[PDB]
Design a protein around this ligand. Structure first.
Ligand SMILES: [Mg+2]
Ligand SMILES: [Mg+2]
Ligand SMILES: [Mg+2]
Ligand SMILES: [Mg+2]
Ligand SMILES: [Mg+2]
Ligand SMILES: [Mg+2]
Ligand SMILES: [Mg+2]
Ligand SMILES: [Mg+2]
Ligand SMILES: [Mg+2]
Ligand SMILES: [Mg+2]
Ligand SMILES: [Mg+2]
Ligand SMILES: [Mg+2]
Ligand SMILES: [Mg+2]
Ligand SMILES: [Mg+2]
Ligand SMILES: [Mg+2]
Ligand SMILES: [Mg+2]
Ligand SMILES: [Mg+2]
Ligand SMILES: [Mg+2]
Ligand SMILES: [Mg+2]
Ligand SMILES: [Mg+2]
Ligand SMILES: [Mg+2]
Ligand SMILES: [Mg+2]
Ligand SMILES: [Mg+2]
Lengths: 102, 119, 48, 58, 210
RNA sequence: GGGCUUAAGUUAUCCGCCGAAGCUGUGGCAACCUGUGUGGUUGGGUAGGGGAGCGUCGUGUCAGUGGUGAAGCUGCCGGGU
């Protein structure tokens, strides 16, 4: 039993007990969120249509906020003297999938 | 107030020599030569972080094409069928299904076949 | 009871000195003069 | 008055300054941007001026 | 505010009373003005005896080191050119004075504000004098410790013959001694308290009063 | 380029898809405008103009700290646009 779910314009193949690296959401740690499912597979049984995917709820809980890798941008063009330094971290949020109830 | 440059100067040199700590020849030993490669490295990394989207989408599309052609359906017809059926599972999850859960991918192929315009 | 370490200038009273020709992230290299010509090196008299 | 629906389908790069100013006056700012205008002859004129850059509906 | 207040002359235990004129010892404390006056003070204190030799002042270097062309070396004009080791310094320091011509009204007002801040904070004491007869440092150390703390300013004004108080407080190293005609904003701000002699306060008030 | 007429050529037409740092989705940063609950617009860039900073040395003051080890040098593990 697993679900193709969506969260923040990006999709994940989740299962109960999995830990997913979700785009940062406002809900506080230890609370629970519902991930919108786009597909459910229970083994030789594939729920795909919107009416049935409406009835299924993928519930998960927030664990904490984690940061991505530190990215170092150095925009550069030769023979002009142009440089531009920048950095990025791209915080996300841990999620633990607790249940896929049809 | 005479100021000696060395203590402040060495900082960027240490930074660059650390950033260039896998390069071949002078590019990992000499600050000036390491500096030139770090400019190229940064440009390449920026370009490739944006080309990575296309590279992985191409890989997913190839795998989906192979998996659907195994079912007698081309990639374009498969994607049009999914779009008409209204299943918005993306190239990525579809490729993961093709590699891992081939039965679920084949069920999606049947969905696309049924949702074809048949015209 | 000010004490000497609480004396600070009014905001905007001490503009930072612009230091020129110290990198390409500021007025660097040509030092705000452009390339070639009389103005690249000295000046032009006001009567000329 | 039929409330013309105008959307930008081509970029303003390399177009004539006339065309770019017409897009600005229509309020279109990006490709795919949509504005609603009255069925007024001035707006019909802007649409026909940038007819190669936008599409119009009702 | 221009309120004149009353402090009590002490001489250790108690004595008559003295008036703080108000127009000085009670005015606004313009922090930017005080900062400018103090900075100008320290700039005037600067000595500025620093110098370097330019390429014209470095010894030697008269002739062209070699021919302009044919040698394969860079064109050089003198061995004392700035880019040479041992050559002249381009824009190194030269002797100068750092004194600033701060206006009289600004300097005085700053002094008034500096005095007024700790007048309102009650850090000015007035004593008839320190020490009696002959002069020790032990005595005044006491008189002042009885006053309060040890980051002190003393005013004795009497520029010619107040040797008793001056030489008593001269060696404390947490006391700054001044004549009333030399109060200056820097020292007033640096002081945590001021103790005036009776004559010191009287002479400062007489020198400047409305 | 391989190869292609058994078009993978030309042409008319129809149905799909691929395809960019364009657009959209999601998350972070920033400039400006606006009534100031919202929101809107914007952020490629040489010469160059404006704005705000990092690091080095000296120094006033205050708080200090240092053979139970300062400076410097050199690892590791981290942090910031
Ligand atoms: Mg060029
Ligand atoms: Mg292929
Ligand atoms: Mg430049
Ligand atoms: Mg350069
Ligand atoms: Mg200029
Ligand atoms: Mg030039
Ligand atoms: Mg040049
Ligand atoms: Mg020229
Ligand atoms: Mg010029
Ligand atoms: Mg001119
Ligand atoms: Mg002249
Ligand atoms: Mg000479
Ligand atoms: Mg040579
Ligand atoms: Mg010469
Ligand atoms: Mg010398
Ligand atoms: Mg893209
Ligand atoms: Mg964009
Ligand atoms: Mg977007
Ligand atoms: Mg910019
Ligand atoms: Mg842009
Ligand atoms: Mg510039
Ligand atoms: Mg100690
Ligand atoms: Mg040192």
């Amino acid at each position: 039993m697993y679900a193709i779910v969506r969260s923040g314009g990006r999709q994940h193949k989740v299962a109960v007990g999995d830990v997913v690296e979700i785009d940062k959401v406002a809900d506080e740690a230890g609370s629970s969120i519902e991930l919108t499912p786009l597909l459910v597979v229970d083994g030789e049984s594939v729920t795909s249509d919107k009416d049935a995917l409406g009835k299924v709820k993928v519930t998960a809980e927030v664990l904490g906020e984690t940061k991505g890798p530190k990215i170092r941008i150095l925009k550069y063009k030769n023979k002009t003297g142009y440089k531009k330094r920048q950095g990025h971290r791209q915080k996300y949020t841990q999620v633990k999938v607790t249940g896929i109830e049809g | 107030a005479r100021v000696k440059r060395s203590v402040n100067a060495k900082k960027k040199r240490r930074e660059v020599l650390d950033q260039a700590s896998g390069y071949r020849g002078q590019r990992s030993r000499l600050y000036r030569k390491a500096k030139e490669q770090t400019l190229h490295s940064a440009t390449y990394s920026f370009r490739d972080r944006r080309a990575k989207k296309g590279d992985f989408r191409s890989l997913w599309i190839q795998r989906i094409n192979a998996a659907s052609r195994a079912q007698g359906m081309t990639y374009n017809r498969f994607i049009n069928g999914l779009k008409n059926a209204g299943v918005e599972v993306d190239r990525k999850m579809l490729a993961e299904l093709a590699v891992s859960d081939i039965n679920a991918f084949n069920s999606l192929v049947e969905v696309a076949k049924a949702s074809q315009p048949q015209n | 009871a000010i004490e000497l370490h609480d004396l600070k200038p009014a905001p905007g009273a001490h503009k930072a000195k612009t230091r020129v020709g110290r990198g390409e992230g500021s007025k660097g290299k040509t030092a705000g003069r452009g390339t070639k010509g009389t103005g690249a090196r000295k000046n032009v008299p006001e009567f000329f | 008055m039929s409330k013309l629906k105008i959307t930008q389908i081509k970029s303003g790069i390399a177009t004539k300054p006339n065309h770019r100013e017409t897009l600005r006056s229509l309020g279109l700012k990006r490709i795919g941007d949509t504005v609603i205008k009255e069925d007024r002859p001035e707006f019909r004129g802007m649409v026909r001026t940038v007819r190669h850059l936008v599409t119009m509906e009702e | 505010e221009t309120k004149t207040i009353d402090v009590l002359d002490v001489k250790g235990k108690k004595a008559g009373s003295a008036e703080l004129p108000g127009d000085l010892f009670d005015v606004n404390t313009n922090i930017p003005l005080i900062h400018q006056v103090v900075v100008a003070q320290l700039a005037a204190a600067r000595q500025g005896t620093h110098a370097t030799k330019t390429r014209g002042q470095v010894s030697g270097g008269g002739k062209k080191p070699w021919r302009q062309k044919g040698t394969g070396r860079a064109r050089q004009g003198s061995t004392r050119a700035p880019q040479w080791v041992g050559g002249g310094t381009v824009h190194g320091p030269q002797p100068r004075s750092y004194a600033q011509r701060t206006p009289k009204k600004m300097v005085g007002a700053a002094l008034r504000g500096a005095l007024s801040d700790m007048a309102r904070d009650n850090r000015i004491f007035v004593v008839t004098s320190l020490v009696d007869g002959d002069k020790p440092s032990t005595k005044q150390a006491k008189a002042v410790l009885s006053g309060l703390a040890e980051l002190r300013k003393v005013l004795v004004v009497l520029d010619r013959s107040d040797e008793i108080d001056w030489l008593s407080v001269r060696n404390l190293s947490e006391v700054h001694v001044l004549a009333a005609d030399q109060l200056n904003t820097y020292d007033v701000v640096n002081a945590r308290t001021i103790v005036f002699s009776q004559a010191g306060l009287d002479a400062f008030v007489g020198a400047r009063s409305a």
